[PDB]
Design a protein around this ligand. Structure first.
Ligand SMILES: O=C(N1[C]C2([C][C]([C]C3=C4[C]=[C][C]=[N+]4[B](F)(F)N4[C]=[C][C]=C34)[C]2)[C]1)N1[C]C2([C][C](N3[C]=NC([C]4[C][C]4)=N3)[C]2)[C]1
Length: 290
């Protein structure tokens, strides 16, 4: 019987890739009508999926880039227990497999990464694993340092799971009101059935703590060009992390844009913020492609 997504659609009817663990990942592609100037992989964050990047991907495709993405394991239309990962490196390995596959089909093209939140931590670790390979990285509120109050609370709960056998332990869900000041976007997020809005399992939170530790060790090795966009009122990824990334990365081409008063999800924020985010990404990638 055909292998199906967690929503029961056969993978033979969808673009897909099988990872090193034999798990099917659902894929998306947005290719221009002509010869692409560059490739760009979009890395989504925790709980969400690649379908949330439709508008950004169509803008990037309008710049003649071939945009590609997949749903990370345990997310969206990919296989895996929801919001579970054996080790955070699985996400990085799977991005690298997909980038390597695309570079075979489109050789000689520059490749960029774009990531938001947990997806931004994945993009940083992917670029750190392959120094000099990526042309540039666009980071939207990347997970570099978690909110101090939330991290201390979770680190206590993590000690309970690390010292004892407690497989079902979960913390509370990611509060939707702190995601964006745009209420319509929050309402849409709360209505998408492919988004997992359940409480974070302690085993998954432990992997996000591993991502933060690994990002910290990767910064003095990071040399890829990057554009970093961060809101000053982010309650999920503390803005101190964006300043730390600007300070500690060795990249010769690094830029930070702060959005005063904005919340976490800058590409789904108030129209003035979202319009600026799209324009800034468009300028930055346009200047670095030809
Ligand atoms: O990747 C992330 N996640 C990673 C994230 C930061 C983490 C902080 C944290 C940590 C860190 C270590 C350990 N922890 B933890 F587990 F203790 N923890 C608990 C709560 C936060 C937190 C949790 C947020 N997101 C959330 C989204 C944005 C959402 N969206 C998509 N469309 C929209 C529209 C409405 C605007 N919103 C999906 C991508």
């Amino acid at each position: 019987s055909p292998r199906r997504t967690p929503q029961s659609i056969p993978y033979q009817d969808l673009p897909h890739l099988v990872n090193a663990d034999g798990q099917y990942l659902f894929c998306r592609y947005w290719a221009p009508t002509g010869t692409p100037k560059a490739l760009i992989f979009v890395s989504h964050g925790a709980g969400e999926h690649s379908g949330r990047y439709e508008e950004l991907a169509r803008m990037l495709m309008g710049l003649d880039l071939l945009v590609f993405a997949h749903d990370h394991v345990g997310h969206g239309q990919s296989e895996g227990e929801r919001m579970v990962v054996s080790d955070f490196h699985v996400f990085v390995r799977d991005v690298l497999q997909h980038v390597d596959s695309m570079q075979k089909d489109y050789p000689g093209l520059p490749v960029f990464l774009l990531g938001h939140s947990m997806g931004g931590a994945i993009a940083i670790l992917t670029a750190a694993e392959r120094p000099g390979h990526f042309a540039g990285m666009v980071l939207i509120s990347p997970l570099v340092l978690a909110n101090p109050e939330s991290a201390t609370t979770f680190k206590v709960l993590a000690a309970k799971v690390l010292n004892s056998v407690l497989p079902n332990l979960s913390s509370g869900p990611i509060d939707s009101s702190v995601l964006s000041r745009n209420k319509t976007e929050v309402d849409i997020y709360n209505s998408d059935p492919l988004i997992c809005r359940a409480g974070l399992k302690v085993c998954f939170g432990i992997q996000l703590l591993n991502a933060v530790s690994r990002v910290e060790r990767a910064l003095p090795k990071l040399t890829v060009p990057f554009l970093l966009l961060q809101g000053s009122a982010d309650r999920l990824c503390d803005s101190k992390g964006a300043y730390l990334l600007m300070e500690l990365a060795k990249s010769q081409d690094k830029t930070l844009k702060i959005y005063e008063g904005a919340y976490h999800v800058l590409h789904k924020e108030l129209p003035e913020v979202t319009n600026s985010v799209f324009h800034e990404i468009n300028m930055w990638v346009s200047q670095r492609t030809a």
